[PDB]
Symmetry: D2
Subunit: 140 residues, 4 copies
């Protein structure tokens, strides 16, 4: 009872559960949108399940965007250069969701992802990065 | 603008982010306790960071325990047999935490884990299972 | 150059990358089979993408099964009780794949899962457990 | 036996195991090094467990580096801009390990991470990115 063992046991029990060489998929996004950097004119978009609610965000986010590309960033900004042009990537939680805004040099539009608060921001910034590259690749 | 491509692009973008052969550790538990099935007399315990708060749970959980081993389970119960004796494992969220209670045949006590609501119940039930085996192994 | 800082920096850099409250799906199984415990007569099965190769396993695994339920287990065995009857769950890597065999009390058959070596055994044992319950539930 | 149910059952069983709002840590790096872009003169470094083997890589990687910053990249390159200067981030598996090389504008050195092949490249590129920022922040 409480023996050195029974104590050091419960402690050895606090240890994490290690998963080795596991394959994991994050969930998929909810929205993938393109809005004019200008007023947030939703050009195109895609979902998983109204269009009202979406627009609410296309504008809301864009707001939060120019509010950081001007009013200000050092921590949550992720600057990159694609096809010899530059763009900034921003994350932002809006109503418990993770979102991403980055600009396109070619058309001055904003690319945008919206996802659960269960979608890892890191993978999100990375995901949007390749998205821009692949995007500008198909348009030069 | 909105070209078959620009639409089917944003859609191909909704896709998950796949992690391949990744190594992941869950967090470690907060508490690993043994309480008399009887009144919840905390026999031994271990933590990661008062003893008051703990007891609150040792009793609270035990309550929720006998309240299911009698008042009733089919979904959240995970019956097992260790060292030729039987025990039931139960999960239960109490104040946004994941917990586990299973009984020891040898001493009639309850083994108990408490963790964040970020600790996968599956790994938790599995974790406590081996815990019982390893436990009863050192005491026969 | 090498300043206390530049060293203690690279060290503070060794740290893990923490994902907080993430949603992750494992991959889905490859095969979900039922074989007569007897000779491994594949009764039913399901896949994701020949039937030859499958049978190779239905028998191969079953072999490894009775070779453990008799020839012998303490670490990789996960005994459980479903609908008042008992069954044992076993894991086993065969050609870099994770598999699971457990028996059905009602028909003496073996339930079986086969998956990548990227599918967490823990979740697998847990997955097959509920499978048995849900299985025997629909047949009494 | 094989009933619509017993088949559609095994199929409903192929489904992934969903982890909801889980907290996961990747493993921690093995090496965090700074080498002169020049010849790979290991300036500073840190580990987790000879110094020989390390150097083998400091040079090996640097080789693979300039071999891509010149000989050539579009997929595995991740250009960024830190503190108004530009740098490129590269990933590269060398002997089943994931590594990262990016250059420092201020000293022309290469920052470098080495990790298991179980460490998600995505998180790695992201991890090194902040590393550069935080690095150049402490030196201006």
């Amino acid at each position: 009872l409480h023996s050195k063992n029974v104590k050091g046991f419960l402690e050895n029990t606090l240890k994490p559960y290690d998963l080795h060489s596991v394959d994991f998929k994050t969930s998929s996004l909810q929205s993938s949108m393109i809005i004019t950097a200008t007023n947030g004119g939703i050009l195109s978009y895609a979902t998983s399940n109204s269009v009202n609610n979406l627009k609410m965000m296309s504008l809301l986010i864009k707001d939060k965007w120019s509010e950081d590309e001007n009013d200000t960033h050092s921590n949550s900004c992720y600057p990159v250069e694609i096809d010899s042009f530059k763009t900034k990537i921003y994350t932002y939680e809006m109503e418990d969701l993770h979102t991403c805004v980055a600009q396109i040099p070619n058309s001055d539009l904003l690319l945008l992802f919206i996802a659960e608060g269960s979608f890892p921001y890191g993978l999100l910034v990375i995901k949007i990065e390749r998205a821009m590259r692949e995007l500008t690749d198909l348009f030069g």
